[PDB]
């Protein structure tokens, strides 16, 4: 049995400025990769011996993914700020945790897609991987929008596809 | 590899 996890966190800075974004990956609850925007030259770097054997273009690619995720987090911070009717001076934190539990053979056993806002849980994809759970009434808005656009299908593309395969490849180097 | 959220909340 195995598992893969990504924790992507963004913290808005007061007034003028752009959020601090960090992203970390865990294979079997061991950190193997890390991104930070504060870094002098923000890129994805390996936090474990084996991941070093991956070609430069891998790092460039996933670094690009991080560079998009930044924008996503900035904008959706603004959105959640709006839903909760909060002053735009406040410092706020938005986190996305997502991953996959893979069984002994290699099949997908569980999928994970969840979002928290300012420490509290906002919205989480259920075990059936097609239904969401929403903590409050803003999360009810997000839930409605995502039921309508079918975000579960979009995430299932990853959970059932890239997640399992890349987890297997990351285990190939252990 | 990481994913991209894409969907606006």
């Amino acid at each position, epitope marked *: 049995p195995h598992s893969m996890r990504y924790y992507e966190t963004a913290t808005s800075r007061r007034g003028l400025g752009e959020p601090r974004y960090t992203s970390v990956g865990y294979v079997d609850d061991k950190e193997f990769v890390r991104f930070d925007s504060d870094a002098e030259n923000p890129r994805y770097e390996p936090q474990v011996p084996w991941m070093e054997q991956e070609g430069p273009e891998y790092w460039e690619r996933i670094t690009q993914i991080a560079k998009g995720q930044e924008q996503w987090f900035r904008v959706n911070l603004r959105t959640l700020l709006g839903y909760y009717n909060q002053s735009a001076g406040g410092t706020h934190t938005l986190q996305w945790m997502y991953g996959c539990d893979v069984g002994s053979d290699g099949r997908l056993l569980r999928g994970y897609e969840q979002f928290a806002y300012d420490g509290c849980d906002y919205i989480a994809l259920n075990e059936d991987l097609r239904t969401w759970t929403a903590a409050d009434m803003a999360a009810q808005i997000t839930r409605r929008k995502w039921e309508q*656009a079918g975000a579960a*299908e*979009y995430y299932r593309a990853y959970l059932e596809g*890239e997640c399992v395969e890349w987890l297997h490849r990351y285990l190939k180097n252990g | 590899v990481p994913y991209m959220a894409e969907f*606006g909340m």
Partner: T-cell receptor
Amino acid sequence: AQSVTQPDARVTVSEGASLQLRCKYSYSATPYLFWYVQYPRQGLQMLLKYYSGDPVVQGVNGFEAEFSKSDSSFHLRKASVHWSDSAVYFCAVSAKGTGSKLSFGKGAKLTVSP
Amino acid sequence: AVTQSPRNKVTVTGGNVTLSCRQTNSHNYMYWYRQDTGHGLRLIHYSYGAGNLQIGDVPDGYKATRTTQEDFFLLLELASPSQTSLYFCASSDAPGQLYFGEGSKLTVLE
């Protein structure tokens, strides 16, 4: 980099007949596939979408598109077309990293003869 | 509902045209496309949230401004006959899921 191809620019079909509009696109490990319809003198409306799962996306208007990983396609079918279905049909695709930036086909003008 | 104005505009080469788009949804993405027979839909400029501006596939001759979440403007300061087309505004809050305006027909005369 991504490219989308619709082979026939103009298609004429009898009313009540069977229709197929074709969409082939450049390879993608992460294909997001769509069909948009544009009725005369309007903008585009999303008709069908596919991100994953059951490759047969089934519309409520009788339309349905099917994603083929092997053929690398997303073809649009209707068993029995209505006269109202006369429109211009665009298929569009996007990939990971540009999920929100579509690549459009040249479209196919559909004339339903009564 | 996405609205755009003007629905019809005629101008001369070297003219100054400003296409306005306003969305009632609170979508983060907004796009300016042009539709030409033979080329289909071609992205000019787009925007992810207010203040943001990104280059499309054919941005030459065009400029754009995203003042607010709801408004997106397309600016043609030196009009060209090549810019004679049918312009569409779109909005999205989901990958590849777009809501179009009803179109703006521009004619540029030599």
